[PDB]
Amino acid sequence: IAAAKDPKDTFEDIPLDTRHHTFTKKISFPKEWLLTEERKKELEAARQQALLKDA
Amino acid sequence: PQEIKDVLDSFRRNVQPFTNVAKPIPIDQFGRACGVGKRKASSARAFVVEGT
Protein backbone atom coordinates (compact mmCIF):
# COMPACT_ATOMS: atom_id res chain seq x y z
CA ILE A 1 0.00 0.00 0.00
CA ALA A 2 2.87 2.38 0.75
CA ALA A 3 4.44 1.59 -2.62
CA ALA A 4 1.08 2.10 -4.34
CA LYS A 5 0.70 5.54 -2.76
CA ASP A 6 4.21 6.53 -3.88
CA PRO A 7 3.67 9.31 -6.47
CA LYS A 8 7.13 8.72 -7.97
CA ASP A 9 5.96 6.29 -10.67
CA THR A 10 2.27 5.53 -11.18
CA PHE A 11 2.98 2.89 -13.87
CA GLU A 12 -0.02 4.22 -15.80
CA ASP A 13 1.98 3.64 -18.98
CA ILE A 14 2.06 -0.10 -18.18
CA PRO A 15 -1.20 -1.88 -19.08
CA LEU A 16 -2.47 -4.48 -16.63
CA ASP A 17 -0.96 -7.84 -17.57
CA THR A 18 -3.32 -10.80 -17.09
CA ARG A 19 -1.38 -13.53 -18.91
CA HIS A 20 -0.88 -15.45 -15.65
CA HIS A 21 -4.65 -16.03 -15.37
CA THR A 22 -6.70 -18.37 -17.56
CA PHE A 23 -10.12 -16.83 -18.11
CA THR A 24 -13.03 -19.26 -18.43
CA LYS A 25 -16.11 -18.77 -20.63
CA LYS A 26 -19.41 -20.23 -19.43
CA ILE A 27 -22.34 -21.17 -21.66
CA SER A 28 -25.97 -20.63 -20.69
CA PHE A 29 -29.25 -21.95 -22.02
CA PRO A 30 -30.57 -19.60 -24.75
CA LYS A 31 -33.28 -17.34 -23.38
CA GLU A 32 -34.98 -17.25 -26.80
CA TRP A 33 -35.97 -20.92 -26.46
CA LEU A 34 -37.90 -20.57 -23.19
CA LEU A 35 -41.42 -21.77 -23.99
CA THR A 36 -43.39 -18.71 -22.88
CA GLU A 37 -46.87 -17.58 -23.83
CA GLU A 38 -45.29 -15.28 -26.42
CA ARG A 39 -43.12 -17.98 -28.01
CA LYS A 40 -46.00 -20.45 -28.23
CA LYS A 41 -47.72 -17.99 -30.57
CA GLU A 42 -44.45 -17.71 -32.51
CA LEU A 43 -44.25 -21.48 -33.01
CA GLU A 44 -47.92 -21.72 -34.03
CA ALA A 45 -47.10 -19.31 -36.86
CA ALA A 46 -44.09 -21.31 -38.03
CA ARG A 47 -45.96 -24.60 -37.65
CA GLN A 48 -48.80 -23.18 -39.76
CA GLN A 49 -46.61 -21.58 -42.43
CA ALA A 50 -44.93 -24.96 -42.93
CA LEU A 51 -48.29 -26.59 -43.69
CA LEU A 52 -49.19 -23.90 -46.23
CA LYS A 53 -45.83 -24.06 -48.01
CA ASP A 54 -46.15 -27.82 -48.51
CA ALA A 55 -49.89 -27.67 -49.22
CA PRO B 1 -64.18 -77.19 7.26
CA GLN B 2 -62.02 -75.23 9.67
CA GLU B 3 -59.56 -78.14 9.75
CA ILE B 4 -58.72 -77.82 6.05
CA LYS B 5 -58.60 -74.02 6.28
CA ASP B 6 -55.85 -74.20 8.90
CA VAL B 7 -53.63 -76.84 7.28
CA LEU B 8 -53.82 -74.96 3.97
CA ASP B 9 -52.61 -71.72 5.56
CA SER B 10 -49.33 -73.49 6.38
CA PHE B 11 -48.60 -74.04 2.66
CA ARG B 12 -49.00 -70.40 1.59
CA ARG B 13 -45.89 -68.51 0.44
CA ASN B 14 -45.86 -65.00 1.92
CA VAL B 15 -42.85 -63.62 0.05
CA GLN B 16 -43.00 -60.06 -1.29
CA PRO B 17 -40.55 -58.92 -4.00
CA PHE B 18 -38.73 -55.63 -3.65
CA THR B 19 -40.20 -52.62 -5.47
CA ASN B 20 -37.86 -50.24 -7.33
CA VAL B 21 -39.75 -47.81 -9.58
CA ALA B 22 -37.82 -45.08 -11.37
CA LYS B 23 -38.78 -41.47 -10.76
CA PRO B 24 -40.48 -39.86 -13.78
CA ILE B 25 -38.65 -37.09 -15.61
CA PRO B 26 -40.50 -33.81 -14.92
CA ILE B 27 -40.96 -30.83 -17.24
CA ASP B 28 -39.65 -27.45 -16.13
CA GLN B 29 -41.99 -24.47 -15.88
CA PHE B 30 -40.46 -23.27 -19.17
CA GLY B 31 -41.32 -26.60 -20.80
CA ARG B 32 -37.82 -28.10 -20.99
CA ALA B 33 -37.15 -31.68 -19.87
CA CYS B 34 -33.67 -32.95 -19.03
CA GLY B 35 -32.58 -36.41 -20.16
CA VAL B 36 -29.30 -38.11 -19.25
CA GLY B 37 -27.36 -40.58 -21.37
CA LYS B 38 -23.98 -42.24 -21.10
CA ARG B 39 -21.49 -44.19 -23.19
CA LYS B 40 -17.96 -45.61 -22.88
CA ALA B 41 -16.70 -42.64 -20.86
CA SER B 42 -19.09 -39.78 -21.73
CA SER B 43 -22.22 -38.40 -20.06
CA ALA B 44 -24.78 -36.20 -21.79
CA ARG B 45 -27.55 -33.88 -20.59
CA ALA B 46 -30.13 -32.94 -23.24
CA PHE B 47 -32.72 -30.22 -22.59
CA VAL B 48 -35.51 -30.84 -25.11
CA VAL B 49 -37.99 -28.00 -25.65
CA GLU B 50 -40.76 -27.28 -28.13
CA GLY B 51 -39.07 -25.45 -30.98
CA THR B 52 -38.07 -25.44 -34.63
* Angle at alpha carbon of residue B36, lines to A23 and A36, rounded to 5°: 80
Please tell me the distance from the alpha carbon of residue B15 to that of residue B33, in angstroms, as a whole number: 38
Tell me the chain A residues in contact with residue B49 when contact means C-beta distances shorter than 8 Å. Answer: 33-35
The H-assigned helical ranges of chain A are: 2-5, 37-54
Tell me the chain B residues in contact with residue A29 when contact means C-beta distances shorter than 8 Å. Answer: 32, 47
Amino acid identity for residue A35 in this structure = L
A43 and B51 within 8 Å at the Cβ level: the answer is yes
Residues 6+ positions from A43 with CB-CB distance below 8 Å: B50, B51, B52
* Resolution limit, Å: 2.8
Q: Does A43 touch chain B (CB under 8 A)?
A: yes
Kindly state the helix (H) or strand (E) to which residue B5 belongs, with its residue range. helix B2-9
CA distance A52 to chain B (A): 16
